[PDB]
């Protein structure tokens, strides 16, 4: 029996190059071909006859076959290159597919930008105040916001809504509302929004006095 | 037939007792140096494995030995079926100026490649041409070309026009 | 199945077939986690009925002896009329209700009204970095969806539109935030374009730094 | 959606030539969930010949009809190990690389109806005190559910527990029953575990005796 | 219970530390457990990064 071995997984960072090897016994005397498979999708050919790439695949992909190791080289890897890679070869009139290789790209950590917006003047005329604190682009999904009015932790009167990472990006974007009522917004001079997250050295607080805007 | 379209007439008369696996080699082809090509290729000087051949004239051939379609070159590729001395049984049962084709090749039931064509003369592409060897290192490309010529896998693909005027794709090496 | 606003419902209780009953039918409604309330009465032997003060105008109790069935019809349903309706039967003249029947769940879906737009003031403290975050608030509307576009759709670089969140009342809230350079805060006109097709509501709203 | 009964047969269909020049070789590849790809066989439309993989030599069958221009493979005697997603590919005639992979086809089964097994659970070695010991019988590798556990003649209900059956890793089930008994009674009294499985029509009994101390 | 950490002080013209974790395995224990690994967590890293080596790969 014949077997082709590949590393279980590989890790790299954006803009770097990753090398995937499909090694074997005297594998340099055979024509290999590599298949890329995204999760939930059928495999799509990426390389046939070692290095002759098909039409449509970006030029970044490149491979070679020599000795007992055949390698696939990726340059400028991006968040769209995550997918399993499969090796192929013919032996003794028997097809052989190499073990699945999982190529992962580790995305960098970006700190959030946070703002606090007071309540519109018009809403107060309708007996309702809503202070909204926002967290701009930030990758690590784990985030925590804590509204403290006049330095008194609050809970049970806030809601959270988030979007999905941009296609050509990896950062979310979060926002939190604090639904209040008039005769409660009329007091507690100091209002604050506290956010904790990676990247930030220490929690950052953005505040605004109830008076003087 | 013109247009590269044969329906059912190819003779499916191929052997299986032998272990050579010529039919089993259809799916994949080995490398140039992985099949011992140079040993056989060294039988003819650089300047039917190579152009150095003396094919004879063939008028008719029994279908009991034909294995696969018989491809012939006008030089434009053409396929000829079995024929009564039109039978649809899968084989179970001249120079172009003067008509027909100079010569061509096929694959036999035993599992070896044999070629026949016009007689050698006494340099040209429309007078003495017999087989697919248009030039010393140029072949007329057809879909089954690899099967009959496994040693020409490394050859490149080139588009040429020949003079009637014929437009066909030929395979040549560096 | 959700009963559309302005419709009516019919709760059915077993009734005497036209003979001695020896029990007084009733009705009871229980809003989710809010206690019990009285709706109306009925005395099979005497066709008369008896309605509560709160539901005086919207209720009507009728019974059919051929089918041995009685029911009450409630019209002009509102969001406040989403609850579980019971049906009890007590002794003739004692007045304590016993043998409470299986509950019936009745639901209605609020109403339809357009959104209200309020602006979120941009940064008041001078941010020399060059990024001031604007945004208009869209809330108190029903049902899904609503669409927000900036500057008549001509500004789509940096716009964020967070998905709508279900408020406690039952309506919806939605926000939209755009980041722009600080130096271009007192020279360009920023306009929200909120459109709600079901209520045919189309409203603009300028957003500018608050005066100081 | 449905479970293909064990021992049944399934077929997968691929587009094929209607009886003319093909210019491609059709092959089939299956994929167990996340376990990589495996090869089954190929079939040239032009040539009646086919090719079979060594592993599946006794369960596959490739045949095609030119009238409908459709080719299909027949797989027989499906088992738990054959659950997977089936692909179809079409590459060049002799380039040895497959292109234009078709949509995935999912085939699933539900293993075979297997009887249970009983394994004693010995009590504590000595536990010579008022700390009533515990003993039980473990039921593993049975399918389909359920089973009923009855103690001696089904006449014991004081402090008897029967935990919900869990789903083992390999599509099977496990379940354990346990009772609490006074320590002093282990010297003389005997305890027996009785289990019943309906689909398997299997009744199994065992003696859960204290293990020897030397 | 069988690993020790030693750390140095940040360089003069820098503020970066350096850590070494030594794992001592008694003989006839390292003769098994084909796969070994070291998993680290810290800020900056998007997710934990583990570096692993097979016993007798080379
Ligand atoms: C006053 O007397 C009675 C009040 O109940 C009325 O007659 C009732 O009518 C029902 C309905 O038709 C009758 O009972 C029926 O019997 C036959 C049996 O095949 C069938 O129609 C149904 O199965 C039903 O049981 C019956 O005549 C009577 N109901 C009783 C006796 O229970 C009557 O109409 C009232 N009004 C007047 C003006 O008499
Ligand atoms: C080879 O035999 C087949 C079957 O008789 C022919 O293929 C098709 O036959 C059906 C009816 O049997 C016709 O409707 C189709 O039109 C035929 N196919 C084609 C492409 O014409 C086929 O004609 C036979 N071969 C030849 C050369 O005629």
């Amino acid at each position: 029996s014949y077997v082709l071995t590949q590393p279980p997984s590989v890790s790299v960072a954006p803009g770097q190059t990753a090398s995937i090897t499909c090694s074997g016994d005297k594998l340099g005397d055979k024509y290999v071909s590599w298949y890329q498979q995204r999760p939930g999708q059928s495999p799509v050919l990426v390389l046939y006859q070692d290095s002759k790439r098909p039409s449509g695949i970006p030029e970044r992909f490149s491979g070679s076959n020599s000795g007992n190791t055949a390698t696939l080289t990726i340059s400028g890897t991006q968040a769209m290159d995550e997918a399993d890679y499969y090796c192929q070869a013919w032996d003794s009139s028997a097809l052989v597919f190499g073990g699945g290789t999982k190529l992962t790209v580790l995305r960098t950590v970006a700190a959030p930008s946070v703002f606090i917006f007071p309540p519109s003047d018009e809403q107060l005329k309708s007996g309702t105040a809503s202070v909204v604190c926002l967290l701009n682009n930030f990758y690590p999904r784990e985030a925590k916001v804590q509204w403290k009015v006049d330095n008194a932790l609050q809970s049970g009167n806030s809601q959270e809504s988030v979007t999905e990472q941009d296609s050509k990006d990896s950062t979310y974007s979060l926002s939190s509302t604090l639904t209040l009522s008039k005769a409660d917004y009329e007091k507690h001079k100091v209002y604050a929004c506290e956010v904790t997250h990676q990247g930030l050295s220490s929690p950052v607080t953005k505040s605004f006095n109830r008076g003087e805007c | 037939t013109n247009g590269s379209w044969h329906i059912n007439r190819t003779a499916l008369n191929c052997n299986d007792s032998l272990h050579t696996g010529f039919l089993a080699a259809l799916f994949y082809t080995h490398k140039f140096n992985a099949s011992g090509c140079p040993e056989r290729m060294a039988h003819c000087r650089p300047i039917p494995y190579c152009w150095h051949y003396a094919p004879r004239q063939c008028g008719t051939i029994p279908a009991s030995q034909v294995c696969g379609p018989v491809y012939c070159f006008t030089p434009s590729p053409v396929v000829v079926g079995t024929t009564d001395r039109p039978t649809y049984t899968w084989g179970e049962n001249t120079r172009p100026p003067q008509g027909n084709w100079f010569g061509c090749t096929w694959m036999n039931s035993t599992g070896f490649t044999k070629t026949c064509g016009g007689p050698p003369c006494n340099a040209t592409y429309t007078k003495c041409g017999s087989g697919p060897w248009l030039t010393p290192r140029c072949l007329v490309d057809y879909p089954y070309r690899l099967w009959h010529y496994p040693c020409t896998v490394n050859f490149t693909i080139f588009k040429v026009r020949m003079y009637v005027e014929h437009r066909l794709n030929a395979a040549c090496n560096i | 199945e959700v009963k559309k606003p302005g419709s009516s419902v019919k709760v059915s209780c077993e009734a005497s077939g036209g003979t001695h009953s020896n029990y007084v039918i009733t009705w009871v409604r229980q809003a989710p986690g809010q206690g019990l309330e009285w709706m109306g009465g009925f005395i099979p032997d005497f066709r008369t009925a008896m309605y509560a003060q709160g539901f005086q105008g919207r209720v009507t109790i009728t019974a059919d002896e051929s089918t041995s069935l009685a029911y009450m019809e409630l019209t002009n349903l509102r969001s406040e009329d989403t609850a579980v309706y019971y049906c009890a039967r007590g002794p003739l003249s004692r007045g304590y209700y016993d043998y409470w029947g299986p509950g019936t769940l009745v639901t209605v879906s609020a109403s339809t009204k357009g959104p209200s737009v309020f602006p979120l003031a941009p940064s008041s403290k001078s941010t020399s970095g060059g990024t001031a975050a604007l945004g208009c608030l869209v809330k108190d509307y029903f049902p899904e969806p609503v669409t927000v576009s900036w500057n008549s759709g001509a500004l789509t670089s940096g716009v964020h539109t967070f998905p709508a969140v279900l408020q406690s009342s039952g309506l919806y809230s939605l926000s939209s935030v755009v980041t722009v350079p600080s130096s271009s805060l007192g020279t360009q006109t920023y306009i929200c374009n909120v459109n709600h097709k079901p209520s045919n509501t189309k409203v603009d709203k300028r957003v500018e730094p608050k005066s100081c």
Side-chain angles (χ1 to χ4, degrees), chain A residues 1-25 27-28 30-165 169-213, chain B residues 3 6-15 18 20-21 24-34 36-38 42 44 46 48-51 53-56 58-59 61-64 67-83 86-91 93-97 99 101 103-113 115-121 123-124 128-133 136-156 160 166 169-173, chain C residues 1-3 5-124 126-127 129-212:
Chain A
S1 301
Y2 208 80
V3 291
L4 292 92
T5 48
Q6 314 193 127
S9 80
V10 176
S11 301
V12 288
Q16 309 319 289
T17 79
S19 305
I20 300 160
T21 54
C22 157
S23 69
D25 272 22
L27 190 50
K30 299 294 184 182
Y31 279 121
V32 311
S33 298
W34 297 66
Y35 288 113
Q36 177 184 116
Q37 164 175 47
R38 216 148 279 100
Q41 318 308 122
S42 308
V44 308
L45 167 64
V46 285
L47 282 101
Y48 72 98
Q49 300 225 277
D50 306 2
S51 153
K52 325 305 165 274
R53 310 186 314 93
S55 84
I57 295 303
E59 188 59 20
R60 282 146 37 217
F61 301 96
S62 316
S64 189
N65 184 9
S66 176
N68 271 227
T69 185
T71 84
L72 164 57
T73 284
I74 270 171
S75 59
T77 177
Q78 289 297 271
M80 217 271 289
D81 292 356
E82 192 295 349
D84 303 6
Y85 287 62
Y86 285 106
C87 178
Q88 169 185 6
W90 275 88
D91 182 9
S92 44
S93 314
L95 211 73
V96 190
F97 271 84
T101 293
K102 159 64 61 175
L103 172 57
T104 74
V105 283
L106 220 62
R107 286 142 296 211
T108 49
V109 161
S113 298
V114 62
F115 306 102
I116 174 162
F117 298 119
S120 149
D121 210 358
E122 303 146 43
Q123 212 178 349
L124 296 181
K125 292 198 209 131
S126 187
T128 298
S130 301
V131 192
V132 63
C133 181
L134 173 138
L135 289 87
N136 226 22
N137 311 81
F138 77 99
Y139 165 83
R141 179 61 184 83
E142 68 99 17
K144 159 198 187 275
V145 293
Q146 182 150 23
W147 289 92
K148 48 170 49 49
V149 310
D150 213 307
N151 216 317
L153 310 179
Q154 294 219 343
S155 45
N157 63 7
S158 64
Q159 324 203 55
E160 256 195 289
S161 44
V162 63
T163 56
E164 327 83 357
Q165 51 256 79
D169 267 344
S170 295
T171 53
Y172 305 97
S173 36
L174 201 138
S175 151
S176 172
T177 311
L178 163 61
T179 185
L180 265 189
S181 279
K182 174 150 46 161
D184 298 17
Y185 179 87
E186 297 294 347
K187 336 174 257 175
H188 313 89
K189 285 283 194 172
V190 169
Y191 280 81
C193 173
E194 174 147 322
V195 316
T196 62
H197 179 270
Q198 288 168 66
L200 293 182
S201 85
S202 40
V204 61
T205 280
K206 271 259 175 51
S207 279
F208 82 98
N209 291 27
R210 202 285 317 264
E212 79 191 5
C213 324
Chain B
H6 49 51
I7 315 309
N8 102 43
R9 202 54 174 288
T10 178
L12 278 73
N13 315 339
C14 312
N15 192 25
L18 273 288
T20 179
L26 294 160
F27 295 84
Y28 78 110
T29 172
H30 321 273
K31 303 207 88 190
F32 210 137
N33 298 342
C37 193
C44 47
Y49 295 94
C50 69
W51 76 330
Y53 214 86
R56 272 74 69 207
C58 54
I61 284 292
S64 266
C67 172
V70 279
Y71 254 71
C72 294
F73 330 101
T74 38
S76 210
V78 57
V79 46
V80 297
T82 46
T83 320
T87 50
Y88 297 174
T89 76
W90 318 315
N93 307 26
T94 302
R95 299 267 176 73
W101 36 100
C104 42
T105 323
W106 81 106
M107 150 41 57
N108 67 356
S109 203
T110 39
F112 310 84
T113 312
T115 181
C116 59
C121 65
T124 180
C128 303
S130 45
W133 290 98
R137 43 157 69 76
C138 277
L139 299 315
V140 183
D141 199 309
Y142 51 101
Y144 298 72
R145 188 259 295 186
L146 301 144
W147 190 26
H148 322 87
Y149 269 101
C151 264
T152 78
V153 62
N154 198 20
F155 280 42
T156 76
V160 86
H166 293 173
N169 238 27
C172 316
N173 83 77
Chain C
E1 70 208 11
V2 185
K3 311 284 151 183
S7 180
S8 63
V9 75
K10 305 182 74 164
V11 185
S12 61
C13 298
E14 273 142 19
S16 267
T19 82
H20 204 117
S21 77
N22 195 259
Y23 60 81
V24 308
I25 301 157
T26 166
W27 270 271
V28 167
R29 173 180 74 159
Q30 157 165 32
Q34 289 296 278
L36 298 148
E37 301 160 17
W38 187 45
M39 275 213 154
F42 189 44
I43 310 121
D45 292 330
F46 296 84
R47 318 301 272 292
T48 88
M50 171 155 188
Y51 301 130
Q53 293 81 350
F55 315 78
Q56 182 96 66
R58 295 133 57 74
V59 307
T60 301
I61 273 169
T62 56
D64 161 42
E65 317 217 343
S66 46
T67 316
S68 298
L69 190 140
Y71 51 85
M72 107 184 289
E73 289 137 335
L74 179 50
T75 67
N76 204 0
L77 316 190
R78 284 273 92 89
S79 99
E80 281 65 350
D81 278 39
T82 283
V84 186
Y85 292 55
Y86 283 82
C87 174
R89 303 217 294 280
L92 162 73
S93 317
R94 304 311 211 81
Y96 56 83
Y97 275 111
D98 172 19
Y99 166 56
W100 281 61
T104 290
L105 174 135
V106 159
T107 320
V108 314
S109 38
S111 65
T112 71
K113 59 185 222 71
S116 49
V117 171
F118 316 101
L120 308 175
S123 90
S124 174
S126 55
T127 298
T131 294
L134 277 290
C136 50
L137 209 158
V138 167
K139 89 198 313 309
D140 289 326
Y141 78 78
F142 186 92
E144 216 80 354
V146 72
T147 288
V148 300
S149 61
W150 287 86
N151 270 21
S152 90
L155 175 46
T156 178
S157 44
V159 77
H160 280 281
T161 301
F162 309 140
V165 61
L166 162 54
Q167 270 197 147
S168 55
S169 316
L171 319 175
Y172 291 140
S173 155
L174 168 141
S175 166
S176 165
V177 170
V178 72
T179 47
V180 301
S182 66
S183 147
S184 166
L185 205 47
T187 74
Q188 289 262 358
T189 311
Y190 289 30
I191 281 159
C192 282
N193 191 342
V194 187
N195 202 22
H196 185 251
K197 285 75 58 167
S199 161
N200 325 299
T201 306
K202 149 60 165 54
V203 51
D204 319 334
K205 175 64 93 193
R206 176 200 197 84
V207 193
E208 53 164 313
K210 53 204 180 271
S211 188
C212 95

